[PDB]
Structures are given as C-alpha cells and as structure tokens.
Symmetry: D2
C-alpha cells in the first residue's frame, strides 16, 4: 500500500514544496498510457505525465536507444561533437519549415526560451520583450519575466522592458467592433499602447501557438499572420514556443505549419525528449550567422550531450515512421466528439476546444453566464483520480477552471473510450 509511513515521513521531512500538492500515492511503475500505484492500481495518464510522454511511458525503442548510449557515449566536454548531435540538428532542419536551419540542443523548456530570448536581444541590440498576459514560458529569469499566467508576485521586479498584451480568447471576448469580437482590432489596439510605452528597444515577441497553462487558448484564424507583421514592422523577432504543441501533438508536426507562419526562432522541449531532459531552439542561417559575428554565448554543461540527443533522434524516427502525427488527428477527433457528447449530457461543460491531442474542457456554473464553476472543477479532478484517471485542471482569473487533456500519441481507441467513460462518471459523481 500507498501508505508506507516511512515513505511519507521522509517526503514530509526532506522535500521542498514547489507548487500544488503531492498526490497521495506512490507511483511504482509506468508503461504505455498508464502509471501504477503501490497497490498495483493502473492510472490512465491523460496528461502524458507533465505532457512529455509522447510515446507513453517506457517505450521499448526509447528504452533501447537509452541503453545503447548509456554504455557507449554519454556526456562530453561542450566543444566536442558526436554523431547524435549532428544527426539530430540535421533532422530538425529537415522537418521544420523553410527558414529554420540551425539548432542548439539544450536541456529544459525554460532554458530553450532563455537561449532564444538572449539571441534576439543580441542580434537586435535591443531588450524589451513582449508576451501574452496568459503565457507560461518557464521559471527561470527571462522565461519567468515573459510569463504572465502566474508567478509574478512576491519575488522582486521583473526583467526591465517586460510587456504583455491580451491573448485573443474567443470563448470570453472583450474587444468589440460593430457588435463583433474583432481580435485583429484588439491586436492593433494592444500594439498601439506598446508603442507608446516602449523606450524604442523592442526586441522580440514571444508566444505559444496554443496557450496551454493559460487555458488551452488557440490563436484564431489570421492572428499569427497579423502578429508576425506587427513584429516585422517594428524590427522585432518572433519567437514561437512549441514546448507543448511541437512534435505532432496538434495534428501537424509543428503548430506553426498549420498557419503557414514561420517564426524567427522556434523553441522545443517537453515532447522532444519523451520524458528525458532535452530541448532546443531552431533559427535561420542568417540569424545564427549574425549572433555568431556578435559573439553569441549559451554554453552549458549538457548542451550537445550525445545521450539525450540520441533519444530525441529516436523519438522523431518513431513519430515519423508510425505516422503518429496523423494518428493525433484521428484520435483527437474521437476524443473531441466524446467530449462534445459529455457536453450534451452535462450543463457544467461550457466549452471544448484545442486541436489534435491538446484539448481543453472549460467547467462553468451557468452555460450562459459562463460563470466559473469553482469547487466543481476540483471535485471532478478528485473523482477522476479515484476512478483511475489522471487529469489536470488550471484555474485562472476570470475564466472557468480548465481541464488540460493531452494523452500520448500512442493512445489506443480503447484507452480513449476508457477515459471518456471514467470522466463521465467522475462528473455525475461530482454534482
């Protein structure tokens, strides 16, 4: 049992608490779309862990490559190259759109965003960074400074030159023009104010294609194209953080492929390492060349380490060969329709949004007031778990609590149905 009192005593005495609460169970093993507790109870992992287990837990091919390299090529001095690094950088150039040529292989999501923000700053000679008011880019300095969905209070000033604009949120619109939510006029209005505040040092805009932590908010039609133009007109780079959207989760290899808008710098992480710490930035030859001339520096302990790179290479291979990107659309369709049926059944489901296998379900009191259903969100989450379904709700100011659903791309038809099943029971048991 999950109750090993020595265990919980040690957890309590020697762990730093870092946000949230610890689930009251001890996870002993993981395989495919499931995690197992100390009792042996299978818990269906509908979040792919911290949204990273793209191939589910302990994928045989992943296990193999890790082994293969653990005992062959592990970690190196950062000036030394090896085959997996060059292979992975080459693959990344080949599968991203034209205009993205060169890669930097790192360890975490925040790290990737920091390296990108640092390069933008260097290359432009400027320093002001603009993000969305509901963003999530990481916990480290610059990454945190561009993060507005949370973490801004009680920890000192933010980086000098930080600005946010409101993200286009079709569910709860707030900017109108002629009895219509004009998200493009909102965007124009947002930039006007930025322009007035700027000290004349706008360097970059950083954005997630779909704001995950912010509540599964998809940038609507024409937006990204509009945003890139605002940047271009101002001499700003556009940095696209696809930590959650990259590597096939939304139905395209990269979310940016859907709009056909290619960013100046693309950052990847979570999905790319398949549970392991691996991340990257991909930029154009022109930008890298200039950064170089200018003395760009981002030298860390694990930059270009062979083991993680070799894992990333295998992840890409499997995704391509097994057509997991298409799979994402087919399974997402099945999952989405299921959620729509629940929404038919239950009045507390106010919205079902997202794309491919990055879906959001917003819980509400009144499907008309769209009044946030406080409390409800958490009982649901609670019953889900009892029922054997791991869910994650995010609760932000002014909107209803949002369930972030993101199962492995290797998820089965059956697992999807099990999830829908459990979720339905959790809801009815909760009201």
């Amino acid at each position: 049992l999950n109750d090993d009192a020595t265990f919980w005593r040690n957890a309590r005495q020697h762990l730093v608490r870092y946000g949230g609460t610890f689930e009251p169970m001890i996870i002993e093993r993981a395989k495919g779309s499931f995690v197992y507790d100390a009792d042996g109870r299978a818990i269906l992992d509908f979040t792919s862990g911290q949204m990273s287990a793209v191939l589910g837990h302990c994928h045989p091919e992943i296990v193999s490559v890790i082994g293969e390299y653990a005992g062959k090529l592990d970690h190196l001095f950062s000036g030394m190259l090896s085959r997996p690094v060059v292979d992975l950088a080459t693959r990344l150039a080949n599968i991203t759109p034209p205009g993205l040529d060169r890669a930097l292989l790192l360890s975490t999501g925040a790290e990737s965003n920091e390296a990108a923000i640092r390069m933008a700053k260097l290359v432009t000679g400027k320093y002001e960074i603009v993000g969305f008011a509901q963003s999530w880019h990481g916990m480290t300095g610059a990454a945190a400074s561009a993060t507005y969905s949370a973490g801004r209070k009680g920890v000192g000033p933010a980086a000098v030159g930080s600005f946010a604009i409101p993200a286009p949120f079709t569910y709860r619109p707030r900017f109108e023009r002629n009895g219509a939510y004009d998200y493009l006029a909102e965007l124009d209005y947002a930039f006007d104010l930025i322009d007035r505040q700027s000290s004349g040092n706008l360097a970059a805009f950083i954005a997630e294609p779909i704001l995950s932590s912010g509540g599964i908010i998809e940038l609507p039609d024409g937006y990204m194209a509009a945003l890139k133009r605002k940047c271009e007109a101002r001499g700003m780079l556009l940095i696209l953080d696809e930590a959650q959207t990259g590597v096939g989760r939304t139905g395209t290899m990269f979310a940016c492929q859907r709009d056909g808008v290619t960013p100046d710098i693309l950052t990847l992480s979570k999905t790319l390492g398949a549970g392991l710490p691996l991340a990257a930035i991909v930029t154009s030859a022109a930008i890298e060349e200039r950064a170089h001339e200018l003395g760009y520096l981002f030298y860390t302990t694990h930059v270009s380490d062979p083991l993680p790179a070799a894992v990333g290479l295998r992840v890409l291979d499997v995704v391509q060969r097994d057509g997991l990107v298409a799979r994402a659309n087919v399974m997402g369709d099945r999952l989405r329709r299921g959620l729509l049926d629940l929404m038919e059944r239950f009045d507390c489901i106010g919205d079902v949004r997202g794309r491919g296998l990055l879906l959001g379900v917003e819980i509400v009191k009144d499907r008309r007031t769209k009044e946030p259903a406080d409390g409800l969100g958490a009982k649901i989450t609670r019953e889900c778990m009892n029922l054997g379904l791991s869910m994650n709700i995010v609760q932000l100011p002014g909107m209803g609590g949002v369930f972030r659903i993101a199962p492995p791309l290797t998820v089965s038809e059956d697992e999807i149905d099990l999830g829908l099943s459990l979720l339905g029971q959790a809801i009815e048991r909760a009201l």
Copy 2:
C-alpha cells in the same frame, strides 16, 4: 577518419554556434577516463567532460540503473511522487551538514541557482543579489545576472539589484594593510560600498567555494566564516553553489564541510548527475517552511522525475562505498606534486592551486611579473590534444590563462602519470 565530410558539412549547416570552437574530431565512444575519436584514438579526459563525469564515462553501475529505470519508471506528472525522489531527497539530507534538511530535484546548474535565488527573494521580501566579480552561475536570467566572469555585454540590462564584490585572490593580491594582503579588510571595504549603494533590499549573497570559471580561486582561510557573518548581520541568505565542488571532488563530500560553514541554501548539479541532467537545492526546514507559507513556486517539467533521481542515488552510493572522497585526496596529492615538479622544470608555470581533484595551473610570461602568457596557453592546450590529452584553459582579464584540471574520481595512478607525461611534452613542444 574524423574527416567525414558529410559530417562536417552538416555541422556547419545546421548547428548554432554557442561559444568557443568545435574540436575537429568526431567522438565515437567513451569509457572510464577516456574518449575515443573516429580513428579510434584514445583521448584522456582530464576535465571529466564538462566536469561532470565523476565516475568517468559509461560506468557500469550507472549503465545498469539507467537501464533499470528506463524501462520501469521514467517521467511523471510533477505532483506525483516515487521512491527514487524520496530516497534521493532523504540521502541528501543525511550527507549534508546539520541545518540542510529539504531538497528540490531539478535538471540543470543554472536552474538550481535560479530556484535558490527565487526562494531567497521570496523568503526575505527583498531582491538585491550580491556575487563575486569573477563568478559563473549559469546562462539563464537570474543566474546570468549574478555571473560576472563573462557574458554581461550586448544583451540588455541585468536584473535590477545586481552587485559584485571582488573575490579574494591570493595569487594577485590588490588590497593591503600594513604591507600585507588583508583579504578580510578587503571584504569589509567591499561591503561598505555595497551598503551605500543598496536600496535597503539585500536578499542574498551567492558564491562558489572555489571559483572554477573564474580561474580556480579558492576562498582563503577564515573568509567564508567572515562572509556568512556579513550576510547574517544584514538579514541576507548565503547561497553556496557547489556545482563544481560538490560530491567529493575537493576531498570532502562538500567543500562547505572543510570550512565548517553551512550555507542557508546549497546548490548542486554537474557531479550529482554523472553526465545526466540532474541538479538540486538543499535548504533548512525553517526556510522551506516559510517559502511554503509564502507560496513558493518552482514547477517544471522534470522536477522530481524518477529516472534522473535514481541515477543521482546510485552516484552517491558508489561514491560512498568506494571511498571516492578519500580517493580524491590521494589522487589529488599525486597530481598536485606532479604539477609542482613541472613548475620546477618550466618557468612558464606561475602557480598550482586548488584542492583535491579541482586543480588550476596558471600560465605566465615572467614568474615575477606574473605577466600573463598569452598565446602560450593556447599552443599548450593545442599540443596537449595532439598528444591525446583534453585540457581546458580559461582566460580572464588581468591574470594569466588557467588550465582547469578535474579528472574523474575514478582516475588511476597510471592515468594521472600519463596526464603529467603528456602535459610535460606539450609544454616543451610549445615553447
């Protein structure tokens, strides 16, 4: 051969350059204290890669544990605990000095420093951070803001409230009192100026016990105790970054054990993961408790992931069982004496310093002017490599180029001698 033209073509076309130059060889395998090129030539790794391969490359026990977990427990949702995390946190509490009780398990060195700086800020309600003018804490925001040995230009303002004081450097003293280098009076003088500048928001002092990037500068007798008092008197936390000194490299488990001065927050990384991305902060129960009450947040993708934690646990086990800490003293003694013999032989060796298996050799023109030997440092480094010896020189303003020597704790008597041998030839071939 190392000349695979497809290889180098791809490196050139698809890699972002991040500082330094790429060594012109392709590393194919690694084992023990050696790395092997495409020709099969063994290169003796006197830097333990990027100073992380504590047990050398591809250590059998490391290989085993990694396997064991790759296929059993890999990556999890950050609210879920598992045995390796609790075991590792518990072990860390047990081997660090009294006053360090609770741990946070992360991925990189900069990340660990960021989490520590963020906690200090939260817990004090303040935000000014003081570091050494020759420090190296990482490339991310806060960590970079506290980094003065390099990286400060062309990338925008630093974090608000950043200050540096000079580090005590006995080789090139600059503060006297009665014809004597009084490093404690220097420290007093340094703080006086800080006091005058501060806005009244001093939160923490961050320091490396031995400044590695800064040139293997060991804080001298009584200093740390003196520094901790300056902090205490000001309501500041002392954060000790043992990324390079921790886990037995200096001859004690933690460098802080040598002085008997225990920091408020201790950060670890490099050595702890043995090539893999794992890092941590260890703080006192009191500080963690307050951070908690205050809402401390540092939630990342891989915080508390089982695989890396399980690796860290094994590293600690092996180090303890095989008495690698003592080994560090015995091998360091042998290595140090060798360097002193070279210094007898060659006039260009101006100083041999450091502790245990973290040694520095400062190259000079004139052992009296102590004039930096420019050029010389790099030919040497160059001949070393030809000779089959991987070395790392750091070149900072006002001092002679420094070789940073830090072989695996598993290094053999023979490997040490080989290194001394090659280094002697490299020198004579270089002048």
Copy 3:
C-alpha cells in the same frame, strides 16, 4: 529691429537647443495680455507664456509684492520658517477640498510631481507608477518616466515599474461595447491588463484632469470617480497634476472640484507662481503623518523660500478678490462660441474642446475622416504670428494637430475678439 546680428550670433554660438525652434524675434517687454518685439510690435499672448501668466505679464500687484520681498526677506536655510510660507500653506489648505490639509512649497512642476511620486512610494512601500499614454508630467527622472506623450526614446530605460493605460478620448474613440464608446469598460479592460503585469507593487496612478500636452483631452463624465475606485481597490494613491488646470483656469479653483473627486495628493505649479518658479503638493494630514513617521525626505535649496511663497500668496488673493475663476467661465464662453463660429466657417476645424480658459482646437483634413491636417496646422500657426497672435500647436501620433489656447484670466472682451479675428484671418490666409 529683431535682426540684431550680434544677438542672433550669440544665440547661435552659446545656447543649448532644447526642443522646438526659437521664434525669430527678440522680445523686449511684456504687459497684460501682450508681448512686444524689438520693433515694438505687440503680440497677443494666447498661451499666457508657457501657460503661467495667470494675471498676464507684469501685473502691478505682482510687481509690488516681489519688490516688497526682494528687499525684505529673500531666501533662507531650509529649516527656517517665515510668514509667507505658513500663510501660503494655510491658504492652500483652506481653498482646496476637504481631505487636503498639508502643503510642500517647491520650485517647478516636475519637482512637485517627483515629491508626490516619492511620497506615494514611501507611504505604500511599493513602486509601480501608472499614467496615461498621452501624459506630460515633466522632464526629470520619475516625472519623465510617467510621461508618455513624448521624450521616451534614445535616453535609456525608464524607471522600473512604469505602466500606461490609454486616456479616454471621446473625439477619436477606440473601445466599443454595443455600438457605443464605453470609456468605463475601456478603463476596466485597461486595469485588467495592468493587474496581470504588476509585480504586486502598485503604488500610485498619476493623472492630469485635462491632458494638455496630450491634446486638450478632458476626462469625461464619471471617469475620475471610476479611476479613484480602481485605485482604492488596489491600495494605490491617486495623484492629480493640476499644473495646467489649477488656480481657476477651467472655471473652478481646481478641476478636481468639478467632479467632486478629491485626490490623495494634488500638485500645482505653473499658474500658482504667475511666471515665477513656485510649485506645490498638497496632501491629507493622514498621509503626511505616515510619510513623516517613515522618514520622508524632499529637502532642496528653495523649498520654503519666502519670496516665491509671498508671490503665490498674492496670486491667490488677486484671483479670489477679482473673481477671476468666474471670469474664466464668462470669457471662456465667449472664446468658445467664437471658435464654434470659425468651425462653422472653416471645414478644417474638426473639434473645439476643453473647459473655461483651457481650450483646444483640433485641425483636420476631412471633418469625417477626421484625417489629421498635417502642414496646415503649422502654416496657421505661422500666419497667426505674422498677424500678431501667439499660438501653440501640439502634434501627436494618430490625431490632428491641436492648438492649445489659454489666455490670461485677466483677458478682456476685446482681446478675445482680437484673437478670434486674427485666428480667422490666419486660417483663410493659410489654405
């Protein structure tokens, strides 16, 4: 003649240029509503100089008091009090609304805003300052940081924690709700974004009742009350800068009297000194008391100097006795109707706004496109001058050039008519 070549040679060789251009004439004397050139030509001063000559130039009573004190009590050590200082502070308490009790007597407008911003910061323990995107508070540090109508580029970062929100501008509305310009919803939307960006250190909102430099933009009905509530709800002080609106110009002693909303800190300057350097902040007994306990400091060379204070006292006396505040309404009405007749005559006049003797006339191409009439504004200004009428146009981004009309409160019916006359000719001569 205005052509003294020695004069212009010296101007050119020894004057620092500080914005704008120097009018090509030499002003020799000034009296009442007129300035006279070297030829003796009278120029009607429709801006009261730099909007400060409330009683016109060289008012006999002003001349008398200045004399009276020049030779009696001039300048003192800042710890020494005198009668004019106490009298003036007492008068200010008596004529401002209830809740404003204590005064600080300074020298310039920016200085007054700095002293107020510094007190807000002290008293709240916070530091973020919010202003309007079209504001003008001064050229010095904090005052400039809160200034968005201009001056923000090429001079380094602004003060940490500076934010702006859009000012409610009824002429060119940009925020709608149900086919209506909802300036209160705009205000709500503005604050929401602020809230998301703030580091949790909001100290004050600083505002002009009528944005003068920004284009004579009057805060519309209910706005100020709404703004004060936003502040209150956030623990922020409201600082009202009446440099241009105070001391009867708008038809009330203080513009804030019109809305019946009393600020936490009121700042005055321009009008108060009647050409001379005198300014002030007025705050509540509670706020002063706390600032005091906290060690508030704003010690300058001329704080509490008797001469300027004695001038300020006389200005208040004359304004009260001669009923210049009412006069402002009667003359403003006459002036306003005149401008409306011109607007009937000329299509280029798009708007006539403002209050009392602080009026604005916005020049446009098309009274429907409301397209800014570039060029036109400046010819007009140019012909005015030839014609003997001193005008001031302000040209800001996205709106038509604005003439800022603000004659002395002592202006005569005849002078008003002369002004209207000349202005009409200037216009027809200009198109």
Copy 4:
C-alpha cells in the same frame, strides 16, 4: 515674539515635513550676512541660507534688477528669446574655460543635473551613471539615483545602471599601498570592479569638486585629472556639479579652474541665482551639436525665462567687479586660521578642511581614534544658535559630524571674527 501661537499652530496643521526639524523661530527680515527673528534678534548667516546667498541677503543691486524686470519682462513662452537669456548664456561661455561654449538656463540644481545626465545618455547611446558613494546631486529621479550620501532607502529601486565608487577621503583613508594612502590606486581598483559589472553601457561619471553634503571632502591632488582619463578611456562624459563650488566660493570662479581639468558638462545653480531659482548646464559646441542632431529635449516652463536670467547676469557682474573671487581667498584665509586656532584650543576639533569660503570642521571624541563625537556636534550647533550663529552639521556613517561653513562672499572681517567668537563660546559651553 517667536512664539505667535497662531503661527505655530498653522505650521503644524498645514506644512508637510520634509527632512530635519523646523528651527523654533520666525524669521522676519534678512540683510547682508544676517537674518532677524520675530524679537528682532540678528542671527549671523554662516551658511548663506541654503548656501545660495552669495551676495548676502537682499543685496541692493539684486533688489534693483529684480524690480527692473518684474515690471518689464517676466516670463515667456519657451520658444521666445530675450536679451537677458542671450546675455547670460554669452557671459557663461566667456568666463568658463575653453571647451565650454553653450548654456541651458534652468531653475534648480537637481534639474540641471537631470538635463546633463539626459544629454550624456543621449549623446552616448548609453545609460549607466557612476557617482561617488558620498555624493548629493538632488531629490529628483536621475539626480537622486546618483545620490549616495542619503535618500536611497524605502522609496523603490534606483535607476537601472547606477553605480558608486568610494570618494578619496584623506582624513579617513582606507586604501593602502606600501604604507601609504594611494588614492589613485584606490581609483584604479574602483574602476576595475565597475568594469566587471557594467553591461557595456557606461555613459557618464558625475562628481562634485568638493563633496559638500558628503562632509567637505576635497578631491586631492591629481585625482580629477586621473578621473577624466578613466572616463575618456571608456567613452564616458564627465559631468561636474558645481552647485556649491561655482561662482567664486572656493577662490576660483569655478573649482574646475584650480585643477585645470575641464569637464564635458558643467552644472551650476545655488550661487548663480543668489537665493532665486536659477540654474544651468554648460557644455561644448560639439556635444550640443550632436545632442541637437539626436533630438535632445529638455523643455520646461521656466527654461529661458528673462527675470531669473537677468538676476544671474547681475550676480556675475557684481562678483567680477567687486573682485569677490579674490575676496573669497582673503576672507577664507582669515576664517581658516581662526578655525585652526580653535582646533588648538579644543581637542574635539579633529580636522579643518575645504577651500576658500567652503570650509568644514569635523567634530571628534578622540583626535587619535578620530572617533566621531556624537551628541557633541548637536549641542554645539544648538549653543551656536542661542548665541546668534547659524550653523549646519552633516552627520554621515563612519565619520565625525561635520560643520559646513559657507558665509557670503560679501562677508566682512568683523563678521568673520564674530563668527569665530560665537563658535568658540558655543564649544566651551557645550562640553
């Protein structure tokens, strides 16, 4: 009597407290080197008020010019020139050293420093400002950011890029080289640390030739020349604030004339206006030209107002004609010798320093420990006043309380002797 209870009641109810305490007397008139209370008691003004009454109080010629202009030319629109402005700018060019050509005429000391700091920033494209740790430049934003003798706590962060270095203080030396206070090596050491911290944006160094608020600390022989070289080598402008030293007080017209080191920008204020609010910056034609091309802006209400300018012109005339600069040396010599005799008499006088009529007397417990004489300083100041002598002591961290003596340049032999007399009695009455 000074006891008018209505008076003190109003002071208490309606004055904002701004530092220090109000002297318990009501000053009714002032003339020459004296101020008179409500009882008619003459108080000898040994500080020239707030160190501004260069010609003493209510100087007949000053009274005349003020009158002359009050009723002739008072205040103007800032784009309009007049004779006094051009005359004063021309005179300033003529009496300052070669290399200072163009002037900007403002209102206060802080304002002048702000305009200078803003121009340096513009012209260099940079923003970091370096000052002395014991400086005093004013209460407004930038000026306050460069002020380290006080005011830095409880009011939020300082301007981004603020640094201080220690000022050379021969009385209490703290940097040695070979048993000698090497203030030049101290300077070298100071800059080294700056260099390491800078983000590569050093714009200017701002300094007082003699730190007045800091304790009458005269920059010693060769220092300024050394400082200017440090600046030059770094592409930094040197701004010299002669608010207290300018216009003959030290025995030369400008203190900078003594060392023969001409600054890039010179700022003046206090003395220049002779009690009235007038200040200025003087820079080179080259710097003004560039600032101009770059769009320099510093447009205020009273910039270039004729009245104050006309006063400044007269002050310069009188100083020149009556040879007040030489007078400063002769009277300063007499005053200095007197203080040295007191120091012979009393053990509590530890040092007598300064130059011309800007003298400092440091009070100590032990003329050997040089232990600050707390309490003593204030009784003395207290008895002085009873005795009829207005003195000002400044008390800073680590040094003994300092009396700042600075009588009018028009002071008589007799007044000097009276002062010495009273001061001697005050001392003996105090111990």
